[PDB]
Amino acid sequence: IGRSLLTYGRRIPLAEWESRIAEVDASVVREVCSKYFYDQCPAVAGLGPIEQLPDYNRIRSGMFWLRF
Amino acid sequence: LSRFLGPRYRELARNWIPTASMWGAVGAVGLVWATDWRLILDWVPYINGKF
Amino acid sequence: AVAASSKWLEGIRKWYYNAAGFNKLGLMRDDTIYEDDDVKEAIRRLPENLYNDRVFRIKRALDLTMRQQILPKEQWTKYEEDKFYLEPYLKEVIRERKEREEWAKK
Amino acid sequence: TFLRWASEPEHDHRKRMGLKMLMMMGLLLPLVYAMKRHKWSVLKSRKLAYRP
Amino acid sequence: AAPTLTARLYSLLFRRTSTFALTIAVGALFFERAFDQGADAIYEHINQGKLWKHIKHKYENK
């Protein structure tokens, strides 16, 4: 109750969350996944023993297929 | 056969008929340039590569 | 042979150390030795606070040359504080080969 | 002027492909350079600190 | 911060990987169209009144 009121107001009952889960579909997931993931630059952190970690070129070039 | 029967392989087929169609289109058009195929080189008068 | 004129000779010893440029890239002398099989065993006898220093010096002083600068002039390894930290671990591997050899011979 | 032409008639058909080679090349080659720079530009920006 | 041509171009036809490969095809059609003339005109203007096409007008169609 403390955060749900310090970040919006309006504690949002369980029924209101539930009605937002009856309207997700395969196309919606497709669109948002395409928007936020496809051909973007990530951030990477690693702590030893890390010598087989592939480079930034070969990690960046895994962020888009070439067939599609 | 029965290992491949289902809706998911037909769905992958209808999903990748873009892949097959573009693959075949590019291959067919490239087969015109490669062998100096004049017979389709004329279907478009825009490539006047024959001197 | 000579002693009084050897003070002249010491001078040329300062000249050559300035001609070869391993001080300019941040190295010490013993970092630039060719590692045949007598020097592949006197490196595996180092203490692990001197082994790691030699790794960091070489990895920094090898990426300068794919970038093609050098390092600031105050940073050059000075002549007299250079360290021969590997002469003693090497004038023992050689001294024990020679021995297996007089054995087999005679 | 007649005799040299008889000794080598490919003069006139040579200096024209020797000209449609420079113009075409002289603009594709400045491209390859740029794609190069991209790739090698991952590695000229790293800092390398030591902490025992 | 007004966008440049690059942002709208990438929104239009570059982030598809099914569009990108094509327009490479396109330049050669355009290049083929615009390059024979661009080289032939300059070569012919460099040296005029000196090749048979500039002399054939004496003997052509009587």
Nearest CA in chain A to B23: A67
Say if the Cβ atoms of A39 and E18 lie within 8 Å.
Answer: no
What is the distance between the alpha carbons of residues D49 and D45, in angstroms, rounded to a whole number?
13
DSSP character at residue D17: H
Query: Nearest C-alpha of chain D: how many angstroms from C97?
Result: 36
Nearest CA in chain A to B15: A68
Q: Which two tokens stand for residue C93?
A: 């591997």
Q: Which two tokens stand for residue B14?
A: 């209808």
Distances (CA, A) of E7 to D39, D43, E1, E11, E49: 21, 26, 12, 6, 51
Residues of A in contact with D39 (CB under 8 A): 57
Resolution of this PDB entry, in A?
2.9
Say if the Cβ atoms of D48 and C59 lie within 8 Å.
Answer: yes
Query: Nearest C-alpha of chain A: how many angstroms from B29?
Result: 18
Residues of D in contact with E38 (CB under 8 A): 23
What is the distance between the alpha carbons of residues C54 and C39, in angstroms, rounded to a whole number?
14
CB C47 within 8 A of CB C89: no
- Widest CA span of chain B, in angstroms? 56
Cα A15 → chain centroid: 25
Q: What is the dihedral of CA C12, C14, C20, C26, to 10 degrees?
A: 170
Distances (CA, A) of C5 to C12, C13, C42, C80, E19: 12, 13, 37, 21, 81
> Which residue bears the tokens 């003693």?
C88
- DSSP-assigned states of every residue in E1-62: ----HHHHHIIIIITTSSSHHHHHHHHHHHHHHHHHHHHHHHHHHHS-S-SHHHHTTSSS--
* Vertex D38: Cα angle to D36 and D43 (nearest 5): 100
Helix (H, G, I), strand (E, B) or coil at C39: coil
Signed CA dihedral, A21, B11, A35, A37: sign only: positive
